[PDB]
Amino acid sequence: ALSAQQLLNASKIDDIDSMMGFERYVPPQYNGRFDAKDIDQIPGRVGWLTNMHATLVSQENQGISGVDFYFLDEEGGSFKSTVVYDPYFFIACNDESRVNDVEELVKKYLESCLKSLQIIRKEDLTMDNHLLGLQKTLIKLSFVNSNQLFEARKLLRPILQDNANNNVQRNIYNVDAKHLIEDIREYDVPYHVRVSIDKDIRVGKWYKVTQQGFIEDTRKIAFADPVVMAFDIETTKPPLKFRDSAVDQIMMISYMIDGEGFLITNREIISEDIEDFEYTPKPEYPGFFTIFNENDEVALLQRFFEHIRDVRPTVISTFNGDFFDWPFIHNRSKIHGLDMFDEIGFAPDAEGEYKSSYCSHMDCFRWVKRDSYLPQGSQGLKAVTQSKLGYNPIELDPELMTPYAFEKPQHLSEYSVSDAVATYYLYMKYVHPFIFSLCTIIPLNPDETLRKGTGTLCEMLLMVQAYQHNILLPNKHTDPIERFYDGHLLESETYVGGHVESLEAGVFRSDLKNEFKIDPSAIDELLQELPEALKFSVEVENKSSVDKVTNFEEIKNQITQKLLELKENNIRNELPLIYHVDVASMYPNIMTTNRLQPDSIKAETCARKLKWAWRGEFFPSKMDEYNMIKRALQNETFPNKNLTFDELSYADQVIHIKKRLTEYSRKVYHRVKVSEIVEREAIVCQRENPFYVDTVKSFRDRRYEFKGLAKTWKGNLSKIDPSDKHARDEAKKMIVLYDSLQLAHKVILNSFYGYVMRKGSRWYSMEMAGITCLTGATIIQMARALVERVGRPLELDTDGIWCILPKSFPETYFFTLENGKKLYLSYPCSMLNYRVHQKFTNHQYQELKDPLNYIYETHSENTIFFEVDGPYKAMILPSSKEEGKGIKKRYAVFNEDGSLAELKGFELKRRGELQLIKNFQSDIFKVFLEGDTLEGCYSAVASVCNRWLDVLDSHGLMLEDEDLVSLICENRSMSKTLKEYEGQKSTSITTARRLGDFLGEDMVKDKGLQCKYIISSKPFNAPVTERAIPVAIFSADIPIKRSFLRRWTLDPSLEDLDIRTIIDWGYYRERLGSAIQKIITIPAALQGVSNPVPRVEHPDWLKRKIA
DNA sequence: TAACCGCGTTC
DNA sequence: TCTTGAACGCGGTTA
Ligand SMILES: Nc1ncnc2c1ncn2[C@H]1C[C@H](O)[C@@H](COP(=O)(O)OP(=O)(O)OP(=O)(O)O)O1
Ligand SMILES: [Ca+2]
Ligand SMILES: [Ca+2]
Ligand SMILES: [Fe+3]
């Protein structure tokens, strides 16, 4: 059966591997002792491991399961080696005394597919006295291949389903071996993952392949250098529509191979032949490019494959090439009678992504999506190049790409080549090191380490730990179909996450004094503290001792004097210090501090009870109204899906049930969802097997290593003499390099926290998550309470606070120790950190000291620390249009040298908002730095405001036509296709429908469409979603333009098709206006400054308050 | 007005 | 099949 498909594929894969330089190396035999102490002596071939794939092998009966491993050797070559390993899962019993009798049943029940049984023991974290050494007994079923593993699962699931059902009825007037199978375990482990965990093999490491197995050569340091190729394809595009592989033909393919690289053109569309040129967008990224101009498009495709076959690439990189480039090449090869798989060994997979056996396909867009830490608006290759490589790549409008084949062809070749070098160097500088390093710790292959979710990455790491501590894997979590609370059906439950406050809007600059009120008891509190806080700063914050530091007293005194001056001069009008405090890796450090772990929460010291906040959303329907709505739906007739209500799937029954319960409650209450929050407590055992905390602690330290290096090189740039341009160039590049790495790790890191609530998680715990958050809320609010009493907090988000402090507040001091060095001290930082460590430290942390006698020690752990960045030059916080409301998660901060430090939330960064507001915000925030007074500052920003206002009061006359197209467009995206939005009205939704009638259904075929639209004045007083014109229409033929423009404005006889007359300038004027009141005018009000843009009227509530 | 939704950010 | 979390701003509709 289905075996045949698999052994066939393995045969084909083997042939391609052979062709591309990957023969199966079988190592010599060896009958001597096999330890890694004696590596050079054992017969074998040492290689660097690049890939991993599951394969089936013949007797070299029904197929044997194994993994092919792809190595690069030290003699400039390549080989492949094969490990076989029997797939296995476990059967668990609800009575240990009778485990043997289950074997005699499953040995006969699964005679059809099982190779061997065995009785094994594992630690089960859900078992009593497991921390005393008691272990759970299990039956290890092993198999010859993975299909036979699957068969046994199909045979076991009825037994497991039946066992969960009540036994039948024979003699009512007063156990079976089957009824003792409690569950199956570790049945859903991907096979090749099972091999890399059990065999501790990882891609990126050096091994010598020998008869006894793989031997890691810890003596080889640096990775081998695989031959990496990146490629870009550009194709013809019929105007305003999209590129279709059926009709459109490939124009040219640009690529690079280890620095060199090439262009190949289809001269049947490229209006001439081409000369060898060079595009070196900066010296770091050379690019001398030969060309092969070819006659036919099939000559082009054959040239590409022929080149690939000759160079033998272990890595092929692209940019979104997974879903555009590779499928386009395949259909074009198919049309032209070329089978891609026989040519370069590539083919789509079950998710429709293109893979090969010998060569990993590295789609940089997957890196950019997961690990670049870039906003979505900055996730196109243009912005990625500017951000990560530091240069501006060649821009060329698509609509011109097909025409410029004939008109300006050498220019187009200069574009296609830009995308090529930008992705090769993006891969080599960022994707290649990070991904391949990750493979050395995560048991997946490059293609998987690149593409899988960060929660899955965590899961992989955690499974290694669980396995190597002999801990039995929990089965994947399963959310119930219905959960209830006080007799109400629950629509959603969750915990209360981060705590964030908007406290104050306006402008704050270091050269413009503000007024502070200082709580005198607060400074009296700090004074009865800083003796032990400065000791804290040396003994805990710098791992030193006061015994070896000299000027302890002198520093203790400077600060005290300053504090005293502030205690008598409570009221002051001084120049501010703009600071930011942030806990380093707050949630990770919170989990490790508290030994937080899904396996650590229980019911029924050894007990650290911590509180969390549960919040449910339910219907106010009581059960009586639910049971009523159900049987009502039971009697009705329902369409099939290729029947009765009870013949539908239980899932669909609740789908219908939810809809009917939604409408019924709105009648009886009009209140459809009720939201309640409950304080809850959970116990957190302090002695549980800490395999989870430790996995987090390790990955944190791993990340901290790169965040530390960034701080190191940010310093090394303070001492770079501004003349030596080459020194500061390399320093600035190292920093971009280590900020990237540290941020790439950050998402994976905090995914250890989110994993606890991920669907299908093996370590689910709503409790642990809520505890993590509520504690974070408590720490951040304790920190705000102090700064409030000693300064003005501006904004606060979960773990960070932007605050303003007098200039007379103690900031930075430098101890001097006997070794001559120095120790940094930010008093505002260690001020909070000492209170953190007085009020949140875990004194109940326990750990195995003597494992043989199960003896535990108790100590105190706390790894929660604020860090400061600052002082900054300016901060600009917007305000809400409503009264008494602020705006969170939006602001602009400026560094001393006038550069932009942080720019949060605003539309300029978000993906495809209204370009007008984007350009306005880009032009506005730098201007807040000008002026000599606060009143003078707001005037400068007022001038640029009115300039933009004049643009719109003039009905857009100052802009040439090529410039107005951009300023008024709003380009928003559609997560799904149009058919999936039925019953919904939005501006994207009508823009897509109209783009569909006008250009064909072929346009909203795919998901993720960029709807570039314009709001029209007509029809008048119609809802704004009705008057949404696709910007594309203004570029079609006047026949088409007029018919639809008349349709979409319901003005059936209209002749003024000029774009300027269609636009609803009052709409855009209202939108720019809202921007100006939120960023400029209403902030100017709460700071005590009359309106600086009088053409934007204050709201009626603020016109009421000024009085 | 208040509830509610899709998107895309800040944590 | 694969799949980190919650809090939030803002257009815009709906009750
Ligand atoms: N992608 C994310 N997934 C889950 N939680 C996140 C994510 N991003 C931020 N957080 C959560 C966990 C964080 O500990 C917490 C605070 O975020 P944040 O201050 O930006 O970074 P961090 O404190 O975790 O690292 P850093 O040292 O860079 O400050 O919010
Ligand atoms: Ca391209
Ligand atoms: Ca932080
Ligand atoms: Fe306990």
Residue numbers in the entry: 31 to 90, 111 to 224, 233 to 662, 676 to 713, 721 to 1185
What sentences appear in the manuscript?
The exonuclease domains of family B polymerases have several highly-conserved motifs (named Exo-motifs), which include the catalytic residues (D290, E292, D383 and D477 in yeast Pol ε). The catalytic residues serve as ligands for two metal ions, and substituting both D290 and E292 with alanine abolishes the proofreading function of the polymerase, which in turn increases the in vitro mutation rate by ~100-fold.
The Pol2CORE-P301R was stable during the purification, gave a similar yield as the wild-type Pol2CORE, and crystallized readily in the presence of DNA and an incoming nucleotide. There were no rearrangements of the N-terminal, exonuclease, finger, palm, thumb or P-domains, nor were there any alterations in the interactions with DNA and the incoming nucleotide in the ternary complex of Pol2CORE-P301R. All considered, this suggests that the capacity of Pol2CORE-P301R to synthesize DNA should not be compromised. The overall crystal structure of the exonuclease domain of Pol2CORE-P301R is very similar to the wild-type structure. In the Pol2CORE-P301R structure, the R301 points toward the catalytic site, forming an ion pair with E292. The R301-E292 ion pair interaction is buttressed by a water molecule that is stabilized by the backbone amide group of T293. Interestingly, we observe a steric clash between the terminal residue of the ssDNA and R301, suggesting that R301 will interfere with the binding of ssDNA to the exonuclease site.
